[PDB]
Amino acid sequence: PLTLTCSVRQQLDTPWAEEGYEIAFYQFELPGQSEEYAGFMTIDEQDGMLTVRGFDFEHVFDLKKGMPQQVSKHGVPLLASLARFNIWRAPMDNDMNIRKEWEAAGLDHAAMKVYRSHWEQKPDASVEIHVDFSLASYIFEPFVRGNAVWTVGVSGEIQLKVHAEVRENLPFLPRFGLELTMPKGTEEIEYYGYGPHESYIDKRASVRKGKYLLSVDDMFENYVMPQETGSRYGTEWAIASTVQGMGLKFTAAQPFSFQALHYTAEDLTAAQHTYELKRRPETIVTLDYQMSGTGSGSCGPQLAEPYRFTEKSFDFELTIQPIFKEEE
């Protein structure tokens, strides 16, 4: 698919702007290995840790929590700690009314309960892991009940297919996504999608589609009251890597929401001023299915119905690939 961009630019120097300054933009869409590496696949399990080695990778899953713990590629570690599912964001200033229902319902901090875990090996040296899980906090009925299928192939890709239902008497969730933690030194972000700045389901009129390259410190927008920031709606693919280009690549079936920061969501929630934010050495990457928009609910109407995350049965379909970006 091809993309045409038409930008309305002026021609003379105004007292406030120069010659080639842009007033508006409009975009338009235009329609237009042979059984050699399956023998290096080895699998073992000790103390619930499923280790899968291949030709040039090594991946360690925790079977009793249903999450990957270590991802390697040519010996390089690519995760710093255990992955999780996340349903909490730092509340915005347009979320002053819905935050009382979120905190009263106990969505402030939830944990994960694994009912059953089971792994196999398909007849092409491919590994499948089936997990039945539930998200719950410590007083109430569980929020999300679902099941996930992790899949490791002969090249080292990690595919996730989670089907989840959510409880019927719950207002609407802030997000639903997979949170990973990549080690120290991951500093470049390169993504194909809408940019070069933040965009949401309802605040997306100023961004345009393209291929952008920036740093993790430039993803962040330092507000006076610290809150949720830096998320890019409708991302097609994204790579988070070091300055030499050793990292991970994320794709999906339909375009997802993408975030990369040096701050976790609880750090942005607990902080009240700009100097209270302590910068972490790691890089928190989040891959959201959907995410509820901003709105203007500080004073006036609430968030609109197509802009909320009011959906109680969904599929996710994420794909993670280790990559050395300079030679792929």
Binding site: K64, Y115, E141, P142
Partner: peptide, 14 residues
Amino acid sequence: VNYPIPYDPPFVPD
């Protein structure tokens, strides 16, 4: 009087 565990009978946390 609140349970300090998720109310999911008969299951207790991992």
